Write a protein that binds this ligand. Structure first.
Ligand code: AKG
Ligand code: AKG
Ligand code: FE2
Ligand code: FE2
Lengths: 289, 285
C-alpha cells in the first residue's frame, strides 16, 4: 500500500543499513536467515515440548494469563537447535553489537515459544517494557538496553495473525490509544526474522483461521547485561554448558560480562575473578578462538 | 551549615524516608551491637591475612596497591551472612525505599580498608556499575541504595565519608568544592544510608597516624539490575544454612519487580528457582 510497510532485507545485507532502519522505522524483517532444515529441526523439538502435559502445580506466567496462547518457556534448555545454532547466529549478533555499542555487552533475558491456535483474538498493543519497568523512564537518546527478536516458526499471514507493528512508534512519548489500522503486518515465512527496537508499539494478531492451523512464534529478548535475565539458565548441567561455544555461554549468563564505561570492571563475577575461571569452564571453541 | 541527621536505630521509618528525600542521607546510631562488629572484624582479619591470589584481580587491578579490598564478604564472613545482611531495620528501610520499584537484592558487599597516608576519593555518584542509572530522571523510582557500615571509628582525622546534602536533586555532578560536603563521623555499630544520585566521597585517611579505616559497603539494588557479585557458586550447605531473606538477597530465589511485571524474574521452567532447586533454609521448606 501507499502507507509504508515493514522493509524486508536479505539475510546477508549490510548491518549499518539494518541499524538505520531500526532508528527510523523501529523494526525490519530479515528474509531467509535460517535455512529450512534448521527451522524444521527446531520445530520438531518444539513439537515434543508441547506434547508434554503441563506440570502439576505453579505456572508463574501461564497462571496470570488466560487463553489464548500455548507456552513453552526457556527453549534454550530443551531445544538443542536453538541452543547450538539459532542462538549464535552471526547476523543476529552483528545486529546486536551495533545496536548495543553504547550500552556494552548484552545477553539472553529469555527465549520462549508462543503458539496461537485457530480462532484466537489479537494481543493488545504494547511495548516490551513490562519485565523491567525501569525501562519506562529511560529517555529516547539513552543507550538502548533491550532488543526483541521474533522468529516465525510457521508462516505469518493476514489470516493467522501476523505481528502488527506501528512504525516509528518508538519516537512517541506515550503509547496512548492507537487503532489497529495504524499498524502494518509482519507477514513472513519460517526462516525469516522480525527485529523490533525498544519502545516500538506492537501486538500479536490472533488467529482468524478456522481449520486447525496454529501460528508459532519464538520470541528472544537480548538485553544489556545490566538487566537481570527473566529466565535463569544457572541450573543447566555442566556437560550441556561446556558443549556450547563461548558466545552461547555468554548469552546464557555463565560468564563475566562488561557494561560500557564508566563500568571499567565488569559484572557477574565473584572473588574478584571471572565466573568462567572460578568454574574452570570449558567450551566447544575454547582452543579455536 | 546543615549536618547529617543522627537517628536512633529504633526511630520511625517514615522519618528515615523523609530524610532521604530531603537530605539524601542519614546516620543510624548503634544499629549493630559491639559483639557483632567484633566478630565481623575478626572474620575480615582472617581474609586480610591471606595474600592476594596469583591471577587477575578485576576490581583491584584498577587501583594502586594501597587499595585494600576483600570482595563478596558474605562468602567468607558468617557474621555478615547470618546477621548483618538480614538486619530488620535495614530491611524496613529498603522495603519503604523500594516501594515504587518492587523487590531488591544484594548487588555487592565488600570491605575497603584505607591505610594511613591516603587522600580522599573524588566526588561522584554510585552510577558507574549500572551506567543506565545515569539516564534515569530524578522522578523515576529508585533502583539502588548504598548502605555504608563503619567497622572502625570515622573521624575528621581518618577520613569519614563526605556527603553533599541534597545533591540528588542536581542535574549533573560537575566539579564541586570540598567545603560543600559534610562528614559522616561515626562509631563502629553506626550505619550511613545514602540515597541514589547523592554526591559523596570516601575521605581517605588524613590520619597518616592511627589504624586503617575499615568500611563495608553494601549495595541493595532493584532485582531488575544484575548483581555485580554472583553468589551462584556458594555451596548448597552454605546457602541452606541462611534464612529465606538471606537467600533472596544473594540471588538464590525468584523475585518480583513492580507491576507491570506481574510474573516475576530469575525463574526457570515457569517455576520459582527455589522450588526447582528444592532449597531448604534456616526458616523455610
Ligand atoms: O504474537 C506475536 O507475534 C507477538 C508476541 C509479543 O509481542 C509478546 O508476547 O510480547
Ligand atoms: O570509603 C568511603 O567512606 C566511601 C567509599 C565510596 O563511596 C565508594 O567507594 O564508592
Ligand atoms: Fe511483545
Ligand atoms: Fe561511592
Amino acid at each position: 500500500d501507499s502507507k509504508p510497510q515493514l522493509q524486508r532485507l536479505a539475510a546477508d545485507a549490510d548491518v549499518d543499513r539494518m541499524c538505520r532502519l531500526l532508528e527510523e522505522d523501529g523494526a525490519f524483517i530479515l528474509k531467509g536467515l535460517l535455512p529450512f532444515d534448521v527451522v524444521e529441526s527446531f520445530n520438531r523439538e518444539l513439537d515434543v515440548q508441547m506434547a508434554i502435559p503441563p506440570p502439576k502445580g505453579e505456572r508463574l506466567l501461564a497462571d496470570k494469563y488466560p487463553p489464548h496462547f500455548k507456552y513453552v518457556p526457556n527453549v534454550a534448555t530443551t531445544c538443542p537447535t536453538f541452543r547450538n545454532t539459532v542462538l549464535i547466529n552471526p547476523v543476529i549478533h552483528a545486529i546486536c553489537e551495533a545496536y548495543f555499542q553504547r550500552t556494552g555487552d548484552y545477553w539472553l533475558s529469555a527465549a520462549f515459544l508462543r503458539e496461537i491456535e485457530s480462532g484466537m483474538p489479537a494481543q493488545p498493543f504494547h511495548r516490551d517494557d513490562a519485565t523491567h519497568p525501569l525501562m519506562h523512564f529511560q529517555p529516547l537518546e539513552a543507550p538502548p538496553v533491550s532488543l526483541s527478536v521474533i522468529f516465525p516458526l510457521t508462516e505469518f499471514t493476514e489470516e493467522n495473525g501476523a505481528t502488527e507493528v506501528i512504525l516509528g512508534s518508538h519516537r512517541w512519548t506515550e503509547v496512548g490509544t492507537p487503532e489497529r489500522d495504524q499498524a502494518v503486518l509482519a507477514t513472513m515465512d519460517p526462516g525469516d526474522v522480525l527485529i523490533v527496537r525498544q519502545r516500538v508499539v506492537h501486538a500479536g494478531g490472533g488467529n482468524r483461521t478456522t481449520a486447525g492451523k496454529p501460528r508459532r512464534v519464538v520470541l528472544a529478548y537480548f538485553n544489556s547485561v545490566q538487566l537481570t535475565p527473566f529466565e535463569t539458565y544457572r541450573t543447566m548441567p555442566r556437560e550441556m554448558v561446556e558443549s556450547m561455544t563461548v558466545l552461547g555461554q555468554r548469552m546464557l549468563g555463565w560468564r563475566t560480562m562488561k557494561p560500557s564505561d564508566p563500568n571499567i570492571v565488569g559484572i557477574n563475577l565473584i572473588d574478584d575473578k571471572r565466573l568462567e575461571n572460578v568454574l574452570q569452564l570449558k567450551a566447544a571453541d575454547s582452543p579455536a578462538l
